[PDB]
């Protein structure tokens, strides 16, 4: 794997792009999404400052609300791109406004998944892949830049947040939504990330939240007493993808049960299909295979997923049944982007076409550019050999 050798595949170079052009492409993506026109192009906003210096956020320009996912992806993008100033400003906002620091609040130790631009939470509860990316980006920051103090002691922040994700106790108390009860963020016996710590829907998962590539990082650098647990989670996730992905198409559902079966959320029964969450599953397993070389099923799974999307050429939807029936929409940049990241594991040379397809895109504009854009920029970095394990 790339971590052992230090050699990350440059998939764009493999399909014949020059390094000058690859650098232009990444830089254009970043400049547009971070510093482009505020109404049509940018998803990053500078929001004054406080005692820790500048504040900024990545946000869903559609809803006009901040998402913990977007903040955490912002941090990952910026650390990968060596953009410390933007990283610190995003982190300052997440830690200042999103992080729940009251030990009697049921979201204690978690980041509000949905928050308004003035810091008013829409929902105090987390979207746990936010936490997963926050912790990992923080470890990467420590590696690349060294640790600061206070909230910029990135390694100490990561250790605390991660320990609490495993060891959080059950807490019942007041929130913006009424009295709620929440637990830990990983199931202690299953060693799987939860879809939610809310006790009413806690015993479920989401394939797109499984990040064995990052669990391996935590297995190396987390507090000692948790390293075996994280190592176990990495094995468990590799098995999870093998069970959860359809055996013909490799499509996964948005939401899932611990045993690998789809889960229909009461408020969103269509979660059993391949939708906006599940786009990312192939990135997660392909990244894991590229870095660590342990998911022996990842190459065949990525081959199957690309073989399926090849049958959709010219009639591309972005919502599918797991067996491959189109359920609506047209092509999206976010799905193009994630499908290109399959090439981190794929063996069949059709992967060149999917990488080429990502290469041909422009940065997103208009109302849906946040989710399309953060997926786009992450996929550009993976495909350029610029998204690396920075181990402290
Ligand atoms: O129930 C709560 C959970 O929902 C919560 O999870 C978080 C929110 O949901 C997930 O992230 C969101 C995924 O959906 C995105 O919305 C759209 C989806 O469509 C994308 O593509 C468009 C499709 O249509 C085309 O016409 C158009 O051109 C395309 O761009 C669009 O780009 C997206 O913006 C949201 O933006 C994401 O935030 C994820 O699980 C969590 O972030 O967790 C708590 C739980 O209580
Ligand atoms: O409260 C939880 C909320 O934050 C989300 O979806 C699941 C709910 O149980």
Residue numbers in the entry: 5 to 396
Q: What did the authors write?
A:
Here, we have studied a potential GH8 xylanase from the shipworm symbiont T. turnerae, the genome sequence of which unveiled a treasure chest of carbohydrate-active enzymes. We have shown that TtGH8 is a single-domain endo-xylanase with six catalytically relevant subsites that hydrolyses X6 to yield predominantly xylotriose. CAZY GH8 enzymes act with inversion of anomeric configuration and thus feature two essential catalytic residues: a base to activate the water for nucleophilic attack and an acid to protonate the leaving group for departure. Intriguingly, TtGH8 shows the highest activity on mixed-linkage β-1,3,β-1,4 xylans, which may reflect a genuine biological adaption to, or at least an accommodation of, these marine substrates.
The classical xylanases and endoglucanases are believed to have the base at the end of helix α8, with the equivalent residue in TtGH8 being Asp281. In addition, structures with X6, with long soak times, all revealed xylotriose product complexes (not shown). A complex with unhydrolysed X6 was therefore obtained by rapid soaking/cooling with a total time of approximately 10 s. Although this allowed access to a hexasaccharide complex structure, the ring-flipped −1 sugar is unlikely to be representative of a catalytically relevant conformation since its position neither allows protonation of the leaving group by Glu73 nor is there a potential reactive water. Importantly, whilst the Asp281Asn variant has allowed definition of the interactions of the −3 to −2 and +1 to +3 subsites well, it highlights the occasional dangers of using inactive variants to study substrate distortion in the −1 site.
